[PDB]
Write a protein that binds this ligand. Structure first.
Ligand SMILES: COc1cccc2c(C3=C(c4cn(C)c5cc(I)c(F)cc45)C(=O)NC3=O)coc12
Ligand SMILES: COc1cccc2c(C3=C(c4cn(C)c5cc(I)c(F)cc45)C(=O)NC3=O)coc12
Lengths: 349, 350
C-alpha cells in the first residue's frame, strides 16, 4: 500500500524530469536542516534516503549544486531531486533522493565503546582510508566538507564500504574570500575554527578526520568539551601550547592572548600500548596546529598505516574481498600524481 | 576522620595568613579544569568546596584576582585560598575554599523534564531574579562571567537561594582590548560569539541568561545544536534573519555572508501556551541580536515579570519566606541608581 509518485530530475543526467515512484516512506531523521526519510524505489526495488529541506527562492541551493557535480564510490550518490508540498504551508521544499546506507561510524564506535571494546584496527584502516579518498576527491574540486564526524560517515556492515554524506555545510573555498568560522561540530573542529578564523582551508577536514581516527583508536573522542576553552585545553594537553608562529598561522588576531603554558605530551602515551605505531604516527601528521603542515587526504591514503590494504592477500574479517580501493581517477590524483606508485600496487593494473 | 591543617589567606579580609582546619574531604568533581572537593571546616562545621587548579608560575591567577573582589549573597564566596602540590609537580596548585551549595539549576530543570513537568513559575522568577542580581553586581566591576549556564547556578533546594559560581572563564572587559571568542558553552552562546567576535561586552551573559529562562519555561534548551550553524539556525527560526545592521553590531566581518532567509516565529508560538505572558515578554527583551538592545541585569530585575516577588505576602510553595531579595548595595545599583525605587518596594524601606 501507499505508493508516492513525483516528478524528479536525475542527479547527474541531463536536466530532464521523469516520473519516479517510491514506497515504504518512513521518517528516519529529523532536526534543524529538516527531515530525512527512508523509502524504497518501485522500479529496481532499491533503498534510498530523502533529505527534505526548505528552498530559498532567492538563488540556488548550494548542496544541490555540489551533489550534482560529484560521483564517487565513497560518497553518497544523488540519484534524484524534486520540489514539493501540498497540505498547509505555502513554501517550496527541495528533496534529494540519495543512496541509502544503514550503519554509521558513530554507531559502530558507540557499540564497541559501550561494550568496553576496541574496533579492530583492520576496520580503522579500511574506514579511514576510504574517508581520505572521499576527501581527496572533493578537495580536488576545491570543495570542503566542513562537517566531518562519525555521524556523517556511512558504512556497509557486510562489504565495509564507507560513503561520506551530508553536504549541507559543504562549500567551495576560494582563496581570499571569507568563510564563516562557525561551521563544524563539537569534538571535531580545527583550532583555527575554534579561534574564529574566517580564512581557513580544506585542511580543516583533515584535522577532523584526525579526530575521528584518534577516536576510533581511543574508544572516546580525543578532544572533548562543551566549549572552545575546554576543547582547547584538551588539544594543548596533547599538542602543547601553540607557539606564536603557530597561533598566527591559525588566526593572527590571537597572538597576544594568554594561553595555558603546558608542555607537549608524548604522543605515544596518549593511546594505550600495542596501538600500531603507524597509526599514532599518522595521527600526529593530521592533528598539527599549523594547517599547512597537516597531511593532504591523498598523502594520508599513502601513509604506511594503510599498507596492509595494499597487500594482495588482505581479506575482510568475514572472509570476503575488500571493497574497491585502487580505482583512482585522474581527478582524484590531480593534487599529486607521482603518489600513484604507492597508491596503486603491482597486482591491480 | 582525617584532619588537615593549612596556612591560608582569607578571601576578602585583611591579607593576614591564618591556620585553617578541614575534614570530611572528598572529591565531588573532575576534571579538565582540575579538581573540586567537598570538605567541612572544623571550628564552624560549615561545608565548603575546594576548587584545586594548576597555577601558572608566570603571572597571577585571574580567577583568584576576581573572586577576591566579590561579596554578594547570590555569588559563591571565596573563603580562603592557598597554594599546594598535586599530581606532578614540578607544578604548584591554587586551592580556592568556597561556599558549598549542594544543588544546581541544571539538576533541578532535569528532574521536572524527566517527569514531563514544568518548573513552577514562582521558582523560575526566584532563580532568574537572583541570577540577575549576581550579574548586576559583577558587571559593575566591569566583570563578565562568560559561561552562564544552568550547571553553574547553584541552588539550596530548601531555601531557594541561588549562587553563581565557576569564575574560571570570567574576565574584566576593557573596550579596545580584544577577548578570545571561544568562551561560553553549547546552548548558551550569544550570536556575537558564534560569529567569533573579539570585542563583545557583558551583554553576552544576558543572552545566556535569556537562554536559561527560556529553557526553564520550555523544559528543554531553546537554541540547541552540535554546531554553530545548527545553533544559528535555531536562533533564526525564532528571531528571524538578522539584518545588515544587526549583523554589523554583532560582528562587522560577517555582514555580507549568505544567511537563511527565514522570518521570525511569533514569540507567542515559541513557548507552550499557558506560559505566562510576562515571561514571554521578558525573554523577548533578552534574546535580541543587537547586543546593546538587551536589558541590563538591573533592568531585568525591575521587569514586571518579577512583581510577584515584591508582593508583601509572597511565600515559597513549601510555606517558607522568600530569601533575601532587596538588600542592594551602592555597587549593585551603580548602573541606574534611580531604579532603586522600583527594586526595594515600600515594605522593605520604612
Ligand atoms: C543533515 O542530514 C543528514 C545527516 C546525516 C546523514 C544524512 C543522510 C543520509 C543517509 C542516512 C543513513 N542513515 C543511517 C541515516 C540516519 C539518519 I538519523 C539520517 F538523518 C540520515 C541517514 C543515507 O543513507 N544517505 C544519506 O544521504 C541524508 O541527510 C543526512
Ligand atoms: C569547573 O568548576 C566548577 C563548576 C561547577 C561548580 C563549581 C564549584 C562549586 C560548588 C559545587 C556545588 N556542586 C553541587 C558542585 C558539583 C560539582 I561536579 C562541582 F565540581 C562543584 C560543585 C560549590 O558548592 N561551591 C563552588 O564553588 C567550584 O568549581 C565549580
Amino acid at each position: 500500500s501507499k505508493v508516492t509518485t513525483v516528478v524528479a530530475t536525475p542527479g547527474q543526467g541531463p536536466d530532464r524530469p521523469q516520473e519516479v515512484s517510491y514506497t515504504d516512506t518512513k521518517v528516519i531523521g529529523n532536526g534543524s536542516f529538516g527531515v530525512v526519510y527512508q523509502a524504497k524505489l518501485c522500479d529496481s526495488g532499491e533503498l534510498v534516503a530523502i533529505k527534505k529541506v526548505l528552498q530559498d527562492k532567492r538563488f540556488k541551493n548550494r548542496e544541490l549544486q555540489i551533489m550534482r557535480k560529484l560521483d564517487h564510490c565513497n560518497i553518497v550518490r544523488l540519484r534524484y531531486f524534486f520540489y514539493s508540498s501540498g497540505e498547509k504551508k505555502d513554501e517550496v521544499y527541495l528533496n534529494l533522493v540519495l543512496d541509502y546506507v544503514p550503519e554509521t561510524v558513530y554507531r559502530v564506535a558507540r557499540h564497541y565503546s559501550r561494550a568496553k571494546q576496541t574496533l579492530p584496527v583492520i576496520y580503522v584502516k579500511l574506514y579511514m582510508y576510504q574517508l581520505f579518498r572521499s576527501l581527496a576527491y572533493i578537495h580536488s574540486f576545491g570543495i570542503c566538507h566542513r562537517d566531518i564526524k562519525p555521524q556523517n560517515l556511512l558504512l556497509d556492515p557486510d562489504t565495509a564500504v564507507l560513503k561520506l554524506c551530508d553536504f549541507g555545510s559543504a562549500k567551495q573555498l576560494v582563496r581570499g574570500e571569507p568563510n564563516v568560522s562557525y561551521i563544524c561540530s563539537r569534538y571535531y573542529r580545527a583550532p583555527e575554527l575554534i579561534f574564529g578564523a574566517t580564512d581557513y582551508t580544506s585542511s580543516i577536514d583533515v584535522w577532523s578526520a584526525g579526530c575521528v581516527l584518534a577516536e576510533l583508536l581511543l574508544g572516546q573522542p580525543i578532544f572533548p568539551g562543551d566549549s572552545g576553552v575546554d576543547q582547547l585545553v584538551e588539544i594543548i594537553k596533547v599538542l602543547g601550547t601553540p607557539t606564536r608562529e603557530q597561533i598566527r598561522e591559525m588566526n593572527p588576531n590571537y597572538t597576544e592572548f594568554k594561553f595555558p603554558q603546558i608542555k607537549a605530551h608524548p604522543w605515544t602515551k596518549v593511546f594505550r600500548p600495542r596501538t600500531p605505531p603507524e597509526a599514532i604516527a599518522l595521527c600526529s601528521r593530521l592533528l598539527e596546529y599549523t594547517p599547512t603542515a597537516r597531511l593532504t587526504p591523498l598523502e594520508a591514503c599513502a601513509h604506511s598505516f594503510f599498507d596492509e590494504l595494499r597487500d594482495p592477500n588482505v581479506k575482510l574479517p568475514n572472509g570476503r574481498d575488500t571493497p574497491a580501493l585502487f580505482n583512482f581517477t585522474t581527478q582524484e590524483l590531480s593534487s599529486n600524481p607521482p603518489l600513484a606508485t604507492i597508491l596503486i600496487p603491482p597486482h591491480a593494473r
